[PDB]
Structure 1
Amino acid sequence: MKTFRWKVKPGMDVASVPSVRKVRFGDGYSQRAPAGLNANLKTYSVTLSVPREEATVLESFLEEHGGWKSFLWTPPYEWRQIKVTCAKWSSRVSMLRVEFSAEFEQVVN
């Protein structure tokens, strides 16, 4: 399975911090270069809230990929399908629902 089809909660953080080449000694003249070709691949701090029964399915999805094996995902932010990778996906199992805190880092390959 190659598509994350679950829904994320309202408050989701998107961090960019692009990669550039910076040369500046002290506080003198500065030079900046775009460095690589795929400058910024962003990062989404995704949070989900799902019934206790579907927690097993969600963790099976996240566990099968297991850090490697990026999967397709359409963020609700720019609505463009991308390839992402997750590595932590902590979870908290309340009385009736479980919350997932995962980090999706977009990739190219």
Structure 2
Amino acid sequence: MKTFRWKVKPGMDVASVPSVRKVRFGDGYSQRAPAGLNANLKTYSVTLSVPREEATVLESFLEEHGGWKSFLWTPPYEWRQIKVTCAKWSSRVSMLRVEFSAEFEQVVN
């Protein structure tokens, strides 16, 4: 398992939708259950900007994993060494720098 040591620009977004077993009744009393064990799985939206020289290197690294292989990554300042996979990324080549916008979905081993 490789890692991901590229730096991340400000504006990274984090989303969290834990899974629960909602079921609705007359006046509340909506019983709740924690569903699975590791219910919640954070989803990250990551933006980077690199000069065109190493854009090919980054693209090759992301292509090597495809959308089926996991790799270690440390979210900035966060106390967890999570494992994450990505399946959507785009790049805006303009003249000198290219900015990558990618999404990173957390997954257990």
TM (norm. structure 2) is: 0.93
- The CA deviation at 1:39 is 1.3
Q: 1:86-106 deviations in whole A, cap 9, x for unaligned? A: 001111111000000111111
Q: Which runs of 4+ in 1 moved over 3 A?
A: 25-28
Whole-angstrom CA distance in 2 between matches of 1:94 and 1:72: 30
Identity across the alignment (%): 100
Change over 3 Å in CA distance of 1:101–1:26 after alignment to 2: farther
RMSD: 1.4
Change over 3 Å in CA distance of 1:22–1:53 after alignment to 2: same
Change over 3 Å in CA distance of 1:61–1:17 after alignment to 2: same
Q: 1:29 maps to which residue?
A: 29
- The CA deviation at 1:20 is 0.9
Query: 1 or 2, which has the higher strand percentage?
Result: 1
Q: 2:63 maps to which residue?
A: 63
Whole-angstrom CA distance in 2 between matches of 1:13 and 1:81: 18
Structure 2 residues not aligned, in runs of 5+: none
Change over 3 Å in CA distance of 1:103–1:27 after alignment to 2: farther
Q: How many residues align?
A: 109
